[PDB]
Design a protein around this ligand. Sequence first.
Ligand SMILES: NC(=O)c1cccc2c1O/C(=C\c1ccc(C(=O)NCCc3nc4ccccc4[nH]3)cc1)C2=O
Length: 240
Amino acid sequence: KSKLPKPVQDLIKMIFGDPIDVNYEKLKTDIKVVDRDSEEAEIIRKYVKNTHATTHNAYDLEVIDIFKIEREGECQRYKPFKQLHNRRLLWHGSRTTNFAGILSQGLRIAPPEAPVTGYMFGKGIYFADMVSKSANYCHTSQGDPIGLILLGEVALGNMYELKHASHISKLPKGKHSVKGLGKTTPDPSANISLDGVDVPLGTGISSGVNDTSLLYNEYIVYDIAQVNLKYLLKLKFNFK
Ligand SMILES: NC(=O)c1cccc2c1O/C(=C\c1ccc(C(=O)NCCc3nc4ccccc4[nH]3)cc1)C2=O
């Protein structure tokens, strides 16, 4: 018999497809349900509502549960970047079968033997400011319509801003991350601050960037320590 709250029990069953509380401990992650009533929940629901891209029209999203997460050791790992400027709360989607690994080991960079296919700025950890760009990476379907998506605090610092694929060998001097510039951006005037982290939850507007290969922004870091995972959402995909 589990002593976890029912939403966390259900999350564990989804991730592991052993007793629930034994499986919980394997994640080496503290997981808390965010109260629907709360400021954090209001902000997160607004981020989901406002940043669904117009071209991702095969589905709408409904937030089922919001969890606050703290991986073992991440406070001390993130410490060197915790004071860097330009820390942003960004989306990362992945298949449900990857989440046991993501929570226990954190987000990782693809190893040498993995293909670079799909990584326009080379192997790194990729994030979006548009929920639906990340949600596409959950590979949900009508038949399997529930997915999981992360919100990470990402220590971007000075961004190396690019408009075309380039598998850079090294970041330029003084730069901490890559940003791919999209044609569409959340309205910067609507950014808010949550616990010292910028949240780009404005509705999508034209960025005014020309000569770019990207419809929407993306953000890449090349050091696993630049990521502090903060929330995990369970999303319902309603397909049209
Ligand atoms: N995921 C996002 O939310 C995202 C947000 C914004 C932009 C992008 C987003 O995702 C992208 C690419 C993507 C993803 C997965 C693979 C893969 O699963 N590859 C398989 C090989 C592999 N093995 C790994 C082992 C450890 C870590 C990573 C690994 N990748 C490929 C491209 C983007 O361009």
